[PDB]
Amino acid sequence: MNIVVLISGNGSNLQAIIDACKTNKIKGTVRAVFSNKADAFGLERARQAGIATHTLIASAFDSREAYDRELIHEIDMYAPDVVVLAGFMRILSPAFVSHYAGRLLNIHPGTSVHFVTDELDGGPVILQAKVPVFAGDSEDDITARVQTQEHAIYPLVISWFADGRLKMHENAAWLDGQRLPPQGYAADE
Amino acid sequence: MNIVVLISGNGSNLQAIIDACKTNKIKGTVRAVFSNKADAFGLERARQAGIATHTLIASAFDSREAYDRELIHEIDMYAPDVVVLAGFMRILSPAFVSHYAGRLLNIHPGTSVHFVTDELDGGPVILQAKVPVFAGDSEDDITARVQTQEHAIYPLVISWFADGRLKMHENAAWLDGQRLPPQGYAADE
């Protein structure tokens, strides 16, 4: 329950998380969407789904500290159990990253989903998904195929988080009771 | 000059103001657009035109005291010279109105725009326009003749304000020094 999702531009990964709560695939509601850009079509998707958005573009702010003091304020209003970055595109800061520790998540390409931390590595990866270099590469495909894996795996890890079976304990990810190791994935032991 | 418009729906009014300031008839700028409602199309108008949306849903707040304290907080970062309500369906507090004093404008469907001075939507009217109903109009045919006056009258009145020509000294709307009559109008006679 209590998912808040940060985003910039178009929102394909967010679509995937609104339909997965909608259909009860993740036990939680996405209680608000934020973007550091107006234009962000992912906003149009949040309002079609009828969820509260908040574009906070900087330049409206005097400093970066000012802006993140504020983004943390409008985010914590919604009492978030998870804060999921899903295309957000802003250089995160020691205070943001520290504020949401163990409830902050991100997705990066090739495609994988990790806990965001201060560790030099970016923080523990939770779930990875490799896509073939296999020949029917109707070039657009390159990314478009990673995208499909993104829409598949981010809802699945957010869902484990909600059901209380993904914890981050001591800069290590922990699925269903035991430690994930550097690349992690499924049925536990 | 720094405008923020508060909305709850289609936003065609938001749009006349965005257009009027774009084509310079208002000497000002729409810094942000706020909303009590998650799905209000006028939010889409604000995104196509580049303006930062912000939407606070009453049910995310526990006390109405809290909603208003938050909505004022978030309007103030934009530092508004005039905050214009355009379709905002919310019952306002004294504290919200007290706070935006003679900077808060409101419009109504017969058309009369006015200074909101009191938590039961009272204040000095600045300008009135009456529309003709003819033999055979439909309720739509009327409502749109009305909509078109709001789009012609609300901007013009924000022009006079964002030009110093309009001010409000003790529940009295004054344009150029002269206290306006209770029906508004703008010149004399």
UniProtKB/Swiss-Prot annotation, chains A, B:
UniProt keyword Lyase, yes or no: no
pH-dependence annotation: Optimum pH is 8.5.
Keywords tagged on the record: Purine biosynthesis, Transferase
GO biological process: 'de novo' IMP biosynthetic process; DNA damage response
Annotated active site: H108 (proton donor)
Keyword Transferase listed: yes
The enzyme's E.C. designation: 2.1.2.2
Annotated positions binding (6R)-10-formyltetrahydrofolate: R64, M89, R90, I91, L92, N106, T117, D118, E119, L120, D121
Pathway(s) per entry: Purine metabolism; IMP biosynthesis via de novo pathway; N(2)-formyl-N(1)-(5-phospho-D-ribosyl)glycinamide from N(1)-(5-phospho-D-ribosyl)glycinamide (10-formyl THF route): step 1/1
Site (Raises pKa of active site His): D121
Function: Catalyzes the transfer of a formyl group from 10-formyltetrahydrofolate to 5-phospho-ribosyl-glycinamide (GAR), producing 5-phospho-ribosyl-N-formylglycinamide (FGAR) and tetrahydrofolate.
Name of the featured protein: Phosphoribosylglycinamide formyltransferase
Origin species: Escherichia coli (strain K12)
